[PDB]
Amino acid sequence: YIYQDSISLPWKVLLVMLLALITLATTLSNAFVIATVYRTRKLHTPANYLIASLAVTDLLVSILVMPISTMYTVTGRWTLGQVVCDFWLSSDITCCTASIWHLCVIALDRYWAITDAVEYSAKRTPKRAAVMIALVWVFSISISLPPFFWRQASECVVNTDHILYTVYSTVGAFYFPTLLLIALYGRIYVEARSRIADLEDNWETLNDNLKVINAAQVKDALTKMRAAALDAQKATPDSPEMKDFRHGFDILVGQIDDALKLANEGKVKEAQAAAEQLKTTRNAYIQKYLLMAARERKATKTLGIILGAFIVCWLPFFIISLVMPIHLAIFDFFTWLGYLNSLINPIIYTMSNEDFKQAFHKLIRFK
Amino acid sequence: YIYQDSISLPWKVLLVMLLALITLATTLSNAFVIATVYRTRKLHTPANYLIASLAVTDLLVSILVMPISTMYTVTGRWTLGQVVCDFWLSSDITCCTASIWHLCVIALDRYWAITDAVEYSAKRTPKRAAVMIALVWVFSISISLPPFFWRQASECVVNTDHILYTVYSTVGAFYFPTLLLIALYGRIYVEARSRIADLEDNWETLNDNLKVINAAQVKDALTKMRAAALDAQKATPDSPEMKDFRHGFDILVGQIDDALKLANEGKVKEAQAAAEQLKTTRNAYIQKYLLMAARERKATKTLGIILGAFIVCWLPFFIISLVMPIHLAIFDFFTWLGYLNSLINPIIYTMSNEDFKQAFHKLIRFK
Ligand SMILES: CN1C[C@H](C(=O)N[C@]2(C)O[C@@]3(O)[C@@H]4CCCN4C(=O)[C@H](Cc4ccccc4)N3C2=O)C[C@@H]2c3cccc4[nH]cc(c34)C[C@H]21
Numbered sequence: 001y002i003y004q005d006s007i008s009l010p011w012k013v014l015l016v017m018l019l020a021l022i023t024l025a026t027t028l029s030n031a032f033v034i035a036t037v038y039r040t041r042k043l044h045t046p047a048n049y050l051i052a053s054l055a056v057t058d059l060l061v062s063i064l065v066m067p068i069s070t071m072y073t074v075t076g077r078w079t080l081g082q083v084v085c086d087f088w089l090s091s092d093i094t095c096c097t098a099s100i101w102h103l104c105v106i107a108l109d110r111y112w113a114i115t116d117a118v119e120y121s122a123k124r125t126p127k128r129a130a131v132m133i134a135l136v137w138v139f140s141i142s143i144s145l146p147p148f149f150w151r152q153a154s155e156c157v158v159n160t161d162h163i164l165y166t167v168y169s170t171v172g173a174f175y176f177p178t179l180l181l182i183a184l185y186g187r188i189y190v191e192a193r194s195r196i197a198d199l200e201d202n203w204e205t206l207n208d209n210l211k212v213i214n215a216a217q218v219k220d221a222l223t224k225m226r227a228a229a230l231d232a233q234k235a236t237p238d239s240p241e242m243k244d245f246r247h248g249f250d251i252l253v254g255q256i257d258d259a260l261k262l263a264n265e266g267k268v269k270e271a272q273a274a275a276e277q278l279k280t281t282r283n284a285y286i287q288k289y290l291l292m293a294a295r296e297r298k299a300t301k302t303l304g305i306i307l308g309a310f311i312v313c314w315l316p317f318f319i320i321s322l323v324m325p326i327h328l329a330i331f332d333f334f335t336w337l338g339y340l341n342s343l344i345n346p347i348i349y350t351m352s353n354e355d356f357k358q359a360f361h362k363l364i365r366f367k
Numbered sequence: 368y369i370y371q372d373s374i375s376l377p378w379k380v381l382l383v384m385l386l387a388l389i390t391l392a393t394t395l396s397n398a399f400v401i402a403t404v405y406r407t408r409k410l411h412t413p414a415n416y417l418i419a420s421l422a423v424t425d426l427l428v429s430i431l432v433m434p435i436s437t438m439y440t441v442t443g444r445w446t447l448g449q450v451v452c453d454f455w456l457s458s459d460i461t462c463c464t465a466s467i468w469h470l471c472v473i474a475l476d477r478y479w480a481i482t483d484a485v486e487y488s489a490k491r492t493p494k495r496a497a498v499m500i501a502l503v504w505v506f507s508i509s510i511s512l513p514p515f516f517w518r519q520a521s522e523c524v525v526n527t528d529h530i531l532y533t534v535y536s537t538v539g540a541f542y543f544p545t546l547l548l549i550a551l552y553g554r555i556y557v558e559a560r561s562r563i564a565d566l567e568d569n570w571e572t573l574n575d576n577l578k579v580i581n582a583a584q585v586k587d588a589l590t591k592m593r594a595a596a597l598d599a600q601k602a603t604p605d606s607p608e609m610k611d612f613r614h615g616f617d618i619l620v621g622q623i624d625d626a627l628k629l630a631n632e633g634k635v636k637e638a639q640a641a642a643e644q645l646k647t648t649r650n651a652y653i654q655k656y657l658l659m660a661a662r663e664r665k666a667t668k669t670l671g672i673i674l675g676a677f678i679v680c681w682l683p684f685f686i687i688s689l690v691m692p693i694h695l696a697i698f699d700f701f702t703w704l705g706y707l708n709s710l711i712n713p714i715i716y717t718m719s720n721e722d723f724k725q726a727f728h729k730l731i732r733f734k
């Protein structure tokens with residue numbers, strides 16, 4: 001029995017439009033992300049090549065899997081033969097696993113950048129990403145290939161005969177990637193909260209007291225700026241390159257010390273001018289590392305949203321497909337919930353990553 | 368800083384005795400299980416060879432890992448050099464992973480027996496188990512071997528440098544095996560509750576009404592026995608071998624029909640004798656399949672307990688070692704909680720499996 005055979009004509013048509021609309025939006029939305037990295041010179045970074053490859057897999061889901069899936073989800077009956085059934089089931093498994101595994105490659109790349117910015121820079125080559133993408137495609141194709149034990153050839157479903165493969169395929173495609181991301185993103189969230197916020201918070205406090213400039217109240221603000229500079233200095237096993245970050249603050253501390261010398265003497269005009277002097281000369285050594293932090297905070301926020309979107313979309317499906325061996329609409333809804341992640345990913349990047357956001361404003365011609 | 372350096376002399380000694388006591392109990396308790404399968408002729412089954420191999424791995428943990436671990440847990444300092452450190456860490460990882468993977472092999476074997484008793488019998492050869500044990504040892508040794516990236520050589524700990532291996536090792540050794548067991552045991556529990564209890568419950572009801580044999584009350588008991596026989600018949604895609612199980616009940620139903628013919632006529636002595644006649648002749652065709660169910664119910668109860676013991680012992684440790692990348696006593700306690708599973712497994716088999724329970728009563732000379 002097919003539950004779809006009891007659905008009314010308006011609901012079946014409404015569902016055909018809805019599904020075709022999200023398939024086309026997935027095609028167009030990914031096509032844009034791919035085009036943007038290709039078109040934009042600034043975006044020719046190994047990091048953006050991973051975003052583009054993630055968008056290629058999601059474009060392949062929208063072309064090879066989703067349109068032919070609207071036909072099957074609404075009617076409930078396979079009508080394209082065994083050869084197209086086998087190619088579609090395999091292309092479903094490879095593309096959806098590769099989309100998930102691209103996330104981990106994007107999250108390992110982020111992890112190594114936030115964990116070893118100095119050493120990782122030389123290693124993070126576009127040639128390295130090429131191997132990581134190829135490895136992801138190799139691992140994904142190698143998942144749909146073993147369930148070809150069909151020594152037999154209406155309905156098109158993946159072979160559930162061998163329990164051990166059903167669970168291995170569920171591990172390699174989801175549970176291994178998500179446990180990796182907990183461990184990976186957890187570290188990223190600890191680094192973004194304890195360091196990419198300690199530099200930014202202690203700088204806010206420094207600029208807030210600079211904006212203040214009675215002479216008595218200036219002395220209390222100048223000693224508040226000194227404390228924030230020392231707590232901002234500790235953000236940053238030899239010390240090369242980080243000595244430059246550490247120097248700017250040590251100078252700002254010395255400049256605050258020389259300014260307070262004029263403030264303690266009683267001079268107000270000589271001290272107020274000494275504060276606006278280090279204002280430009282601080283934002284000459286510090287704004288370099290400070291701007292870096294905004295880019296870090298930004299890139300981890302989008303990843304956080306991407307990972308949240310990934311868990312919400314793919315956890316129900318993989319929880320159900322593991323429970324399945326132990327209603328059909330629930331399964332049809334969750335496959336499309338997983339398919340929806342291919343549409344959610346490009347919109348997250350276009351709304352959170354300002355390179356793609358600016359890029360989008362350019363094609364719609366919005367200022 | 369070592370937390371152990373602040374522990375008092377009586378507590379350190381008390382902890383040395385406690386740990387040596389559980390190490391020796393693990394050695395002796397596994398040695399017995401191994402000996403029992405080796406000594407007993409009846410126990411020369413591929414199923415019992417898995418119990419014995421599971422006991423070999425747990426004996427290897429008690430010899431190669433646990434005694435040298437009491438020294439380290441109580442003192443908190445490694446004092447046996449780098450060569451013994453590397454062999455001990457590797458032998459820890461291989462043996463503990465193999466013990467866990469033996470569980471899945473024991474649970475796949477149970478799953479295939481309860482899911483395909485007829486076809487699986489011919490496949491379940493001791494030669495098949497030899498490959499499954501070798502595959503488990505091959506996979507386990509292959510886990511401790513990659514963390515040999517130590518291009519460097521007080522403290523003896525596993526290399527945590529490469530995050531991707533830490534999580535892969537955590538997946539291959541625990542999360543993949545436990546998700547497999549949920550899927551495997553879930554099926555076993557569904558088969559044991561819906562079938563190995565439907566035969567047993569409908570037989571209780573049949574024997575309860577036979578124990579009854581006023582003539583009016585006999586007719587209500589005889590028609591209650593008929594209903595239970597038809598519901599017991601449905602326990603059991605061609606029908607060979609299962610036609611023999613189905614026949615016994617169909618005859619019992621016919622024998623109840625012939626008995627009720629004497630009961631409806633008004634005859635009490637002719638009908639009461641007809642019930643005690645099918646009592647022996649039923650327990651000639653049915654007690655064969657009925658005894659099989661007790662053995663099935665028994666074997667799934669021990670597995671349930673083993674799996675429960677496995678989750679309680681190994682989940683905290685593997686949850687912590689995945690959290691670790693994102694106090695040292697917590698880690699020392701949970702390793703020993705995992706080590707304890709090597710002692711819990713042989714006592715579960717000796718108290719739940721009646722072959723080992725009888726075997727134990729023989730060495731202590733108890734009747
Ligand atoms: C979202 N995708 C849907 C694919 C799917 O479920 N296909 C079928 C045709 O749709 C079903 O869900 C339908 C819905 C109504 C009844 N259905 C089914 O019973 C099965 C369930 C099933 C799920 C997984 C594997 C085998 C069967 N289904 C199928 O086999 C399955 C597909 C998949 C299988 C194995 C590993 C994988 N990695 C990544 C993926 C993936 C993508 C994933």
Ligand SMILES: CN1C[C@H](C(=O)N[C@]2(C)O[C@@]3(O)[C@@H]4CCCN4C(=O)[C@H](Cc4ccccc4)N3C2=O)C[C@@H]2c3cccc4[nH]cc(c34)C[C@H]21
Binds near residue numbers: 459461699
């Ligand atoms: C119970 N076993 C204990 C082993 C262990 O934890 N060894 C060390 C020496 O003890 C520690 O737990 C101690 C306790 C006090 C501080 N310790 C540590 O920080 C680490 C933690 C650690 C755990 C896993 C991997 C690497 C480090 N530890 C170690 O490396 C680790 C060991 C293990 C690692 C990887 C895969 C594995 N499969 C099966 C196992 C296994 C068995 C498992």
